[PDB]
């Protein structure tokens, strides 16, 4: 009952024009993809918002191909499997969230899409909620279901560790280690949550500098013609 | 010509005074808030919809799909701060150089904070997130400590017997068009304005100094529009989840209530008084109190200098209720446990006591030190 | 007679404008 | 002699007609010039980590 | 006895170095309006270019020159014998009207 | 008199191209014009630049979104 | 309520100047940071005491919340 | 008073002449039309919704279980042609009477028209039938005959390649607010 405030570690994308890293983001989506998509779900992504982003078209189609998914009705008045599509939101691990908890000793995974900007912290509390996992101090006795890790809010997760070094291997052929790993997803799930954020960086850039421009200016203006009255100078004269 | 007649009276060449300050640039700014949230929600109101269904998916769907969707939300969430802000300067303005003197102009006032106020309470529920929901079933359900038809006010008011999509739908019906009223208001904010001609930071009549508002106070409440937008888009571009909750980005559940429940940060400080008093209806009242005693402060008004310029003992306990509201609005975003019950509850109590008993002895005093 | 000059100045002033935002 | 700041004037904005074709021309190639260049600093800010930095990769 | 610290709240309320007396700071009602209008030629014209000037430094956020700043002991009240006479004559109007 | 009325000294407050009380004023006054006159212009057309991409925007929210322009 | 029919003024004279004659910003950091500094000193008195207040309180306050967070040494302690 | 003096100057004391027939009873019938409009259309929208998946629901919904949600909606959509024919009686007696000789009044009037023109309009769609949907369909796509840009004005408009929930959803914001635009024209 006590908190853990996670720390500030230094992202790729922290500073103020600073931009997200997308092969670093193109290695977080295959961490979801292989480890997280098999629990988690994330609703409101699809493959083609992969698409220049961290991946092609063409990449991107085939990885939406690789995943079958439902469509229909057909002309028999029924419901049949196709291969995915660029347009095809990514398949959601089970069909409600009663079968996550049933699946889960009554826990539900959460929808990783906001996950960033639904918990205070965002990056610095997944990343040292992923990384963090630790052995329960003396006295720290968890019941069935529950591993200890400090940085979640109970102290009693219900999550397995998720990711281990290893647990999956890049393309790129980076050295697939657990923090590299909570790094590189961590990097993704920025993105799910605020794919906006790059361009968002460049219109700040852009108004920092506009604002820059005119606010002299127009203040300028403004001393120019408050000039007539600021300068002016006030005579007093009665009659005896 | 009727129509420019009404613009030159109004705009152009209105005799101004001529030393008015920058505490006069936020009318101006809070009817550029009003146009700014009007035109942005419009354009949100075009891809939204308010069923418990698709409402979450919609402001998601923005955000994500809809071409400069993201930016048009933030400027009008981080926007109707902006809103507020201006307002707090707006009122705190006339408390400190007496502009409440102008009772109808001040009193239309009053009513133009409510409605915003309602109007911003009615638009946080509409994207359906958990602090939305559980915001609405906190602060309607209030209501229930009236006397005797409270209960049936709330439930009349819900359309049901809780928050619920009946609340949600009409709550858009009601943001969309109360902005409107809150602009006609506004219209007749200004009408009485015109009669009774504008203040000064002195407090004394500029009628032997005035200027034509045009070109004058023209470029200056546009310099000002800048800095207001310089301030939004500052917050839109690198600090739009600043001001915000994060778990009104948790999809709403009934079933489940997050742990610190609160208000948004303009609520805060009467929250605070809400939290203060134990008993429920006393909350109420003192909650309402809190907003509406600014209806009171004209004919709490002892002292024979208008302005607080003039006036060391008044300055000193207004920037005193400015500090002690800023230490409700503390207050009220912290969770209600000690220290923060009696920090709340002296704060509370000082707020109430520097309005109606304090500032007017002040006032009174002044008075005797000059000889009057 | 002499707002000739200036409304074709004006008309160029305006046909750019079309071309400013389209 | 002629100065600099007036040679604008006497030629360029003295008429209100002139002043706008000035403006309008002269917004015209601000937007390509700002645009052009405050990307060109974002992207030299941000080396290496955007898709157009890292696209001949994989196309 | 408070003399001293009447002469303190006066320099401490900052009328003074505008260049204004108490009574042109005075909040103006009907029977200040109507004391002001009572006021002969010289007060009148007076007090108008004192208020014109104060109101000139209020705009540029400056002050007068430290002499020329209002004295407690030199501080006139212009004003009051009117607005005295006109407050008299209102409250025996309205005790007149009470019966 | 009112030929006791000498208009105050404006040297403090006056641009250095007319400071000179024998100068003919009118050799800098298009310079003096022209520099006031560009701030002015440069204000403009830095606004236009930002109202062009805000309208923009706004235009392009009410056009086809990206989820229609994927499943076309 | 018109330029006009506002009020009677009588005996003044007030010089003013072209903007285009005078200049935009005169003795700006010459003059003004010693005004700004005055109006500082004027002022600062009133305004700050109270927000100074307000920052004592709330870190007091922050801290004896973080205070009464923490574990505490009678918590079952000499009691076996 | 500089309210009442307004309404004075308004409704109670204006000079009126005094051989006026019914034909002038239009006007204020005109706006006790646009104000019926308002609030039954604000009590219709407290509950229908504007996405393609519950707009007809919704608005059957009403008619069905809101209480006396049935007897709004048909003052809403009736009202609506009273408003029309009350227009076309108005606009008629200014061409016979010659009152379109107060030229900017009736300007203002021919606005106040094809703003009513665009609200009804915008009306029909959102309840989501078949000849609301098709309307839309026909007479939006008129705007493609345009000579050079109509195909790219109508896509815009619609928000995408036909009419659809981006349409939908607009044209339910259009329509609760241009009526204020309207009373403000008015
Ligand atoms: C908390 C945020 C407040 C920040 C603003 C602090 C301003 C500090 C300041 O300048 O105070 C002194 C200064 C001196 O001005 P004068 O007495 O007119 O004399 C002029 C002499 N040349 O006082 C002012 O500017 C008064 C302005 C008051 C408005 C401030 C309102 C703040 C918000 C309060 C909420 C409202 C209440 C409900
Ligand atoms: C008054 C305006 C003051 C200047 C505002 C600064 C922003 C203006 C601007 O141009 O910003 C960049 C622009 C987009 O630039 P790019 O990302 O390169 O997109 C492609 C551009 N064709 O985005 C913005 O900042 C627009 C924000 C406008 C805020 C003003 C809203 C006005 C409210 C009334
Ligand atoms: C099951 C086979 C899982 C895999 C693989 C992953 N997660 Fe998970 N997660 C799971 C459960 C059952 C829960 C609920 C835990 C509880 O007790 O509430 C979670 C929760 C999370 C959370 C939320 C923590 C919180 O503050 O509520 C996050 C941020 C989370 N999970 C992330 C995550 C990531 C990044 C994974 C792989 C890269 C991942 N999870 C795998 C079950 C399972
Ligand atoms: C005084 C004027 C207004 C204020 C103060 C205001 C305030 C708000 C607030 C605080 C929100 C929640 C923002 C969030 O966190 O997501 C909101 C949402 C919304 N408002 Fe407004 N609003 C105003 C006017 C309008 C108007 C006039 C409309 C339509 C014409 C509109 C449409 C919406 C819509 C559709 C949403 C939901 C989408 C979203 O959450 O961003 N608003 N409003
Ligand atoms: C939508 C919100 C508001 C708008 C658009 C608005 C608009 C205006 C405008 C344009 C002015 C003239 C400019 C100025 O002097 O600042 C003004 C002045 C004033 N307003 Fe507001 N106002 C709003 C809210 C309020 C509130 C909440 C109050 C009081 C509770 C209030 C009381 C006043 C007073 C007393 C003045 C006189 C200012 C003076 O002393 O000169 N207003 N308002
Ligand atoms: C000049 C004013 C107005 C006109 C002429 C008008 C006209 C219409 C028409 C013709 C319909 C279709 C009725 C049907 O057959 O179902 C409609 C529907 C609707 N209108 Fe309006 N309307 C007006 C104002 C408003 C206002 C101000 C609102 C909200 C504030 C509103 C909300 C609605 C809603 C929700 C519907 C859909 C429910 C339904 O179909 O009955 N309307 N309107
Ligand atoms: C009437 C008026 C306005 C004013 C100007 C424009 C307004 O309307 C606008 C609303 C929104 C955007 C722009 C202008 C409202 C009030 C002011 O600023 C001032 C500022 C100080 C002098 C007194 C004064 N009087
Ligand atoms: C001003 C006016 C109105 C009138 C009445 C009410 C109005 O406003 C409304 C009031 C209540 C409901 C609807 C409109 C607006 C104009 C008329 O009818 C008439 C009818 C013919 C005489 C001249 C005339 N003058």
């Given at each position: 009952?006590?908190?853990?405030?996670?720390?500030?570690?230094?992202?790729?994308?922290?500073?103020?024009?600073?931009?997200?890293?997308?092969?670093?983001?193109?290695?977080?989506?295959?961490?979801?993809?292989?480890?997280?998509?098999?629990?988690?779900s994330?609703?409101?992504?699809?493959?083609?918002?992969?698409?220049?982003?961290?991946?092609?078209?063409?990449?991107?189609?085939?990885?939406?191909?690789?995943?079958?998914?439902?469509?229909?009705?057909?002309?028999?008045?029924?419901?049949?499997?196709?291969?995915?599509?660029?347009?095809?939101?990514?398949?959601?691990?089970?069909?409600?969230?009663?079968?996550?908890?049933?699946?889960?000793?009554?826990?539900?995974?959460?929808?990783?899409?906001?996950?960033?900007?639904?918990?205070?912290?965002?990056?610095?509390?997944?990343?040292?909620?992923?990384?963090?996992?630790?052995?329960?101090?003396?006295?720290?006795?968890?019941?069935?279901?529950?591993?200890?890790?400090?940085?979640?809010?109970?102290?009693?997760?219900?999550?397995?560790?998720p990711?281990?070094?290893?647990?999956?291997?890049?393309?790129?052929?980076?050295?697939?280690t657990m923090?590299?790993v909570?790094?590189?997803?961590?990097?993704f799930?920025?993105?799910?949550?605020?794919?906006?954020?790059?361009?968002r960086?460049?219109?700040?850039?852009?108004?920092?500098?506009?604002?820059?421009?005119?606010?002299?200016?127009?203040?300028?203006?403004?001393?120019?013609?408050?000039?007539?009255?600021?300068?002016?100078?006030?005579?007093?004269?009665?009659?005896k | 010509?009727?129509?420019?007649?009404?613009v030159?009276?109004?705009?152009?060449?209105?005799?101004?005074?001529?030393?008015?300050?920058?505490?006069?640039?936020?009318?101006?700014?809070?009817?550029?808030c009003?146009?700014?949230?009007?035109?942005?929600?419009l354009?949100?109101?075009?891809?939204?919809?308010?069923?418990?269904?698709?409402a979450?998916?919609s402001?998601?769907?923005?955000?994500?799909?809809?071409?400069?969707?993201?930016?048009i939300?933030?400027?009008?969430?981080?926007?109707?701060?902006?809103?507020?802000?201006?307002?707090?300067?707006?009122?705190?303005?006339?408390?400190?150089?007496?502009?409440?003197?102008?009772?109808?102009?001040?009193?239309?006032?009053?009513?133009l904070?409510?409605t915003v106020?309602?109007?911003?309470?009615?638009?946080?529920?509409?994207?359906?997130?958990?602090?939305?929901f559980?915001?609405?079933?906190?602060?309607?359900?209030?209501?229930?400590?009236?006397?005797?038809?409270?209960?049936?006010?709330?439930?009349?008011?819900?359309?049901?017997?809780?928050?619920?999509k009946?609340?949600?739908?009409?709550?858009?019906?009601?943001?969309?068009?109360?902005?409107?009223?809150?602009?006609?208001?506004?219209?007749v904010?200004?009408?009485?304005?015109?009669?009774?001609?504008?203040?000064?930071?002195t407090?004394?009549?500029?009628?032997?100094?005035?200027?034509?508002?045009?070109p004058?106070?023209?470029?200056?409440?546009?310099?000002?529009a800048?800095?207001?937008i310089l301030?939004?888009?500052?917050?839109?571009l690198?600090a739009?989840?600043?001001?915000?909750?994060?778990?009104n980005?948790?999809?709403?559940?009934?079933?489940?209530?997050?742990?610190?429940?609160?208000?948004?940060?303009?609520?805060?400080?009467?929250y605070?008084?809400?939290?203060?008093?134990?008993?429920?209806?006393?909350?109420?009242?003192?909650?309402?109190?809190?907003?509406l005693?600014?209806?009171?402060?004209?004919?709490?008004?002892?002292?024979?200098?208008?302005?607080?310029?003039?006036?060391?003992?008044?300055?000193?306990?207004?920037?005193?209720?400015?500090?002690?509201?800023?230490?409700?609005?503390?207050?009220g975003?912290?969770?209600?446990?000690?220290?923060?019950?009696?920090?709340?509850?002296?704060?509370?109590?000082?707020?109430?006591?520097?309005i109606?008993?304090?500032?007017?002895?002040?006032?009174?005093?002044?008075?005797?030190?000059?000889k009057? | 007679?002499?707002?000739?000059?200036?409304?074709?100045?004006w008309?160029?002033?305006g046909?750019?404008?079309?071309?400013?935002?389209? | 002699?002629?100065?600099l700041?007036?040679?604008?004037?006497?030629?360029?904005?003295?008429?209100?007609?002139?002043?706008?074709?000035?403006?309008?021309?002269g917004?015209?190639?601000?937007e390509?010039?700002?645009?052009?260049?405050?990307?060109?600093?974002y992207?030299?800010?941000?080396?290496?980590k955007?898709?157009?930095?890292?696209?001949?990769?994989?196309? | 006895?408070?003399?001293?610290?009447?002469?303190?709240?006066?320099?401490?309320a900052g009328?003074?170095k505008?260049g204004?007396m108490?009574?042109?700071?005075?909040?103006?009602?009907?029977?200040?309006?109507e004391?002001?209008?009572?006021?002969?030629?010289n007060?009148?014209n007076?007090?108008?270019?004192?208020?014109?000037?104060?109101?000139?430094?209020?705009?540029?956020?400056?002050?007068?020159?430290?002499?020329?700043?209002?004295?407690?002991?030199?501080?006139?009240?212009?004003?009051?014998?009117?607005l005295?006479?006109?407050?008299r004559?209102r409250?025996?109007?309205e005790?007149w009207?009470?019966? | 008199?009112?030929?006791?009325?000498?208009?105050?000294?404006?040297?403090?407050?006056?641009?250095?191209?007319?400071?000179?009380?024998?100068?003919?004023?009118?050799?800098?006054?298009?310079?003096?014009?022209?520099?006031?006159?560009?701030?002015?212009?440069?204000?403009?057309?830095?606004?236009?630049?930002?109202?062009?991409?805000?309208?923009?925007?706004?235009?392009?929210?009410?056009?086809?979104s990206?989820?229609?322009?994927?499943?076309? | 309520?018109?330029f006009?029919?506002?009020?009677?003024?009588?005996?003044?004279?007030?010089y003013?100047?072209?903007?285009?004659?005078?200049?935009?910003?005169?003795?700006?950091?010459?003059?003004?940071?010693?005004?700004?500094?005055?109006?500082?000193?004027?002022?600062?008195?009133?305004?700050?005491?109270?927000?100074?207040?307000?920052?004592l309180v709330?870190?007091?306050?922050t801290?004896?919340?973080?205070?009464?967070?923490?574990?505490?040494?009678?918590?079952?302690?000499?009691?076996?």
């Amino acid at each position: 009952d006590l908190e853990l405030h996670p720390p500030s570690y230094p992202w790729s994308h922290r500073g103020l024009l600073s931009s997200l890293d997308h092969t670093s983001i193109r290695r977080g989506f295959q961490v979801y993809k292989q480890v997280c998509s098999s629990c988690h779900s994330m609703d409101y992504v699809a493959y083609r918002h992969l698409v220049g982003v961290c991946y092609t078209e063409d990449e991107a189609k085939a990885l939406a191909e690789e995943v079958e998914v439902q469509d229909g009705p057909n002309e028999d008045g029924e419901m049949f499997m196709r291969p995915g599509k660029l347009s095809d939101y990514f398949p959601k691990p089970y069909p409600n969230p009663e079968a996550a908890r049933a699946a889960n000793n009554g826990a539900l995974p959460p929808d990783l899409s906001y996950i960033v900007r639904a918990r205070h912290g965002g990056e610095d509390y997944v990343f040292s909620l992923l990384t963090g996992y630790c052995e329960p101090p003396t006295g720290v006795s968890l019941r069935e279901g529950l591993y200890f890790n400090p940085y979640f809010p109970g102290q009693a997760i219900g999550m397995a560790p998720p990711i281990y070094n290893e647990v999956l291997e890049f393309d790129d052929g980076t050295p697939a280690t657990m923090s590299q790993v909570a790094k590189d997803v961590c990097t993704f799930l920025r993105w799910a949550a605020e794919p906006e954020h790059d361009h968002r960086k460049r219109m700040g850039l852009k108004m920092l500098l506009m604002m820059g421009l005119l606010l002299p200016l127009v203040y300028a203006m403004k001393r120019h013609k408050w000039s007539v009255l600021k300068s002016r100078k006030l005579a007093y004269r009665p009659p005896k | 010509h009727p129509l420019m007649k009404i613009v030159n009276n109004a705009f152009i060449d209105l005799p101004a005074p001529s030393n008015i300050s920058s505490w006069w640039n936020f009318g101006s700014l809070l009817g550029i808030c009003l146009i700014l949230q009007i035109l942005t929600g419009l354009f949100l109101a075009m891809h939204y919809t308010s069923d418990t269904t698709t409402a979450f998916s919609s402001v998601t769907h923005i955000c994500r799909d809809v071409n400069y969707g993201w930016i048009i939300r933030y400027m009008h969430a981080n926007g109707a701060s902006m809103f507020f802000i201006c307002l707090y300067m707006h009122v705190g303005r006339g408390l400190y150089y007496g502009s409440y003197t102008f009772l109808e102009t001040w009193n239309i006032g009053v009513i133009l904070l409510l409605t915003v106020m309602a109007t911003a309470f009615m638009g946080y529920v509409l994207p359906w997130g958990q602090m939305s929901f559980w915001g609405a079933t906190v602060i309607t359900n209030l209501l229930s400590a009236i006397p005797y038809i409270g209960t049936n006010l709330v439930e009349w008011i819900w359309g049901g017997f809780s928050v619920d999509k009946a609340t949600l739908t009409r709550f858009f019906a009601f943001h969309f068009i109360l902005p409107f009223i809150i602009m006609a208001i506004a219209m007749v904010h200004l009408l009485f304005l015109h009669e009774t001609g504008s203040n000064n930071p002195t407090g004394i009549s500029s009628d032997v100094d005035k200027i034509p508002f045009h070109p004058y106070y023209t470029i200056k409440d546009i310099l000002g529009a800048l800095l207001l937008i310089l301030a939004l888009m500052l917050l839109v571009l690198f600090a739009p989840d600043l001001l915000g909750d994060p778990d009104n980005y948790t999809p709403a559940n009934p079933l489940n209530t997050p742990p610190h429940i609160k208000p948004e940060w303009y609520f805060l400080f009467a929250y605070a008084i809400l939290r203060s008093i134990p008993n429920k209806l006393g909350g109420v009242l003192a909650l309402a109190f809190s907003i509406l005693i600014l209806a009171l402060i004209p004919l709490l008004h002892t002292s024979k200098q208008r302005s607080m310029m003039f006036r060391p003992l008044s300055q000193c306990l207004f920037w005193a209720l400015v500090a002690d509201l800023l230490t409700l609005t503390w207050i009220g975003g912290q969770p209600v446990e000690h220290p923060y019950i009696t920090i709340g509850q002296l704060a509370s109590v000082l707020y109430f006591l520097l309005i109606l008993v304090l500032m007017p002895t002040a006032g009174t005093i002044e008075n005797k030190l000059l000889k009057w | 007679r002499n707002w000739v000059p200036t409304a074709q100045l004006w008309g160029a002033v305006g046909a750019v404008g079309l071309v400013s935002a389209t | 002699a002629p100065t600099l700041t007036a040679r604008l004037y006497s030629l360029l904005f003295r008429r209100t007609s002139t002043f706008a074709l000035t403006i309008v021309v002269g917004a015209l190639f601000f937007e390509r010039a700002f645009d052009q260049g405050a990307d060109a600093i974002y992207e030299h800010i941000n080396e290496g980590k955007l898709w157009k930095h890292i696209k001949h990769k994989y196309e | 006895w408070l003399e001293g610290i009447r002469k303190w709240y006066y320099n401490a309320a900052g009328f003074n170095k505008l260049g204004l007396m108490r009574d042109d700071t005075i909040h103006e009602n009907d029977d200040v309006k109507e004391a002001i209008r009572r006021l002969p030629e010289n007060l009148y014209n007076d007090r108008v270019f004192r208020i014109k000037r104060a109101l000139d430094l209020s705009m540029r956020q400056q002050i007068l020159p430290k002499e020329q700043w209002t004295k407690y002991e030199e501080d006139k009240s212009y004003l009051e014998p009117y607005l005295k006479e006109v407050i008299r004559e209102r409250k025996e109007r309205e005790e007149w009207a009470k019966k | 008199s009112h030929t006791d009325i000498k208009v105050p000294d404006f040297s403090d407050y006056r641009r250095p191209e007319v400071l000179d009380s024998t100068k003919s004023s009118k050799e800098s006054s298009e310079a003096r014009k022209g520099f006031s006159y560009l701030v002015t212009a440069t204000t403009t057309v830095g606004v236009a630049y930002a109202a062009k991409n805000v309208v923009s925007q706004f235009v392009s929210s009410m056009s086809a979104s990206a989820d229609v322009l994927a499943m076309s | 309520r018109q330029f006009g029919h506002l009020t009677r003024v009588r005996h003044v004279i007030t010089y003013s100047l072209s903007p285009f004659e005078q200049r935009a910003f005169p003795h700006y950091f010459s003059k003004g940071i010693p005004n700004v500094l005055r109006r500082t000193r004027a002022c600062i008195l009133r305004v700050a005491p109270p927000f100074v207040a307000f920052y004592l309180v709330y870190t007091w306050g922050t801290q004896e919340f973080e205070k009464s967070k923490r574990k505490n040494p009678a918590a079952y302690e000499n009691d076996r």
